[PDB]
Amino acid sequence: MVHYKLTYFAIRGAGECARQIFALADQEFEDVRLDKEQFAKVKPDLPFGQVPVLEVDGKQLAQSLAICRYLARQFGFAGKSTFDEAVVDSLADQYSDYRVEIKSFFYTVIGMREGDVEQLKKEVLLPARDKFFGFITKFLKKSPSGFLVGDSLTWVDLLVSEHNATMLTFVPEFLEGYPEVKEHMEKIRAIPKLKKWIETRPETLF
Amino acid sequence: MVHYKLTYFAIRGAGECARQIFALADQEFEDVRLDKEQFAKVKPDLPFGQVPVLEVDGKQLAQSLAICRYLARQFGFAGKSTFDEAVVDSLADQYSDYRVEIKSFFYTVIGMREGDVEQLKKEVLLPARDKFFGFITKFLKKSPSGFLVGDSLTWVDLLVSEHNATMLTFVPEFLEGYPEVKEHMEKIRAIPKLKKWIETRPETLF
């Protein structure tokens, strides 16, 4: 069959969505986890000199979003129509904008950058999250099934549920003003094959 | 009969790549260009409070990339295989990473934010275009046909060529060490249905 290989760091981060799609599909893949120094050696061979990279039968595909969308389409977690597919897409991009907003908080909290936590929480993380969650919860309120688009799992469900789960580990009161978002993170993560993966996957933080 | 409406500002920006596919596909649409006050009355009703928004028989879709991809799939400008569609997706995502890096210089020229144009250009813009252009050149040099993916026009071809033409009007030597980038811009813009649009669309600053 198709051979899949995902090359990324030894964290969840931007590789985890792919992993979560594979586990939802019962799809074997080679899960290759690099440290900093091995990234430095292989990166000139990557399409944009960056991880995560997906090879399918040796053919490279980079960019988490493009990878996550591709695998979802292959295994039917993209949306049930091309329009719902675009809607999934639009939420995943809104999520990414958010992530750009908070890049200075996250990289400080994960100990990879210099800065003041509580202050970067106040001025950068909490605003950015309010806007993002404000929009996310409108989608959730118009969804009786609890999934972000339609009434079936799509790849954004994973992006957002997994990020929230990670955040709680750094910011215990992250879901404070947002009961729907919390309900969503628990609904997605209790999906048996996903649940199995969260239990068995390598343990990192973030 | 499918009715399309594009809602955006009186500006090229995030709306234009949608407009260009509509030009290539010979597809009628309502080009709705709003001002400050108009946007503000409508803002609460947009899915993430932002334009561009596309209405497809009344269904809203936000986020420029989600929008262009969806349009591209409809009219055969997305890629020839779902993998190629992935690779186009990833160059679009790289393009946007590069727009995030250059934001600071972009809002300065545009007269949106403060900051020095000698500084920001040397320090932010040109090293970022250097990184990015090496990528685009690599895909170009891999292509016998001139497009960035495959032997056919794709929607990242439109985003990349429209940004270069735009940047060219703030930075006269953006593109000086980069003949194949220039040839790509010239080649995409000469496509007759797109040429006619560039010549007939309203003239705006950006």
Residue numbers in the entry:
A (entry chain A), B (entry chain D): 1 to 206
Show me the paper's own sentences about this structure.
GSTs are homodimers that catalyze the nucleophilic addition of reduced glutathione to various diverse electrophilic substrates consequently facilitating their inactivation, and extrusion. GSTs are a major detoxification system for helminths, which have limited detoxification enzymes and apparently lack the cytochrome P-450 dependent reactions.
The orthorhombic Na-GST-1 contains a tetramer per asymmetric unit which corresponds to a Matthews' coefficient of 2.3 Å/Da and solvent content of 46%. The primary and tertiary structures of Na-GST-1 are more like that of HpolGST than Na-GST-2. All the main chain atoms for all 206 amino acids for all monomers were ordered in the Na-GST-1 structures however some monomers have disordered side chain residues, most prominently in the region from amino acids 105 through 132, interestingly these residues are include some of those that break the higher order symmetry of the Na-GST-2 structure. No such density was observed in the electron density maps for Na-GST-1, instead scattered density were visible in the substrate binding cavity. A rotation of Gln around the Cβ will allow sufficient room for gluthatione to bind. Na-GST-1 was crystallized at an acidic pH 4.6 whereas Na-GST-2 was crystallized at a more basic pH of 7.5. Furthermore, the cavity is more open in the absence of glutathione (in the case of Na-GST-1) than with glutathione bound (in the case of Na-GST-2), suggesting a conformational variation upon glutathione binding.
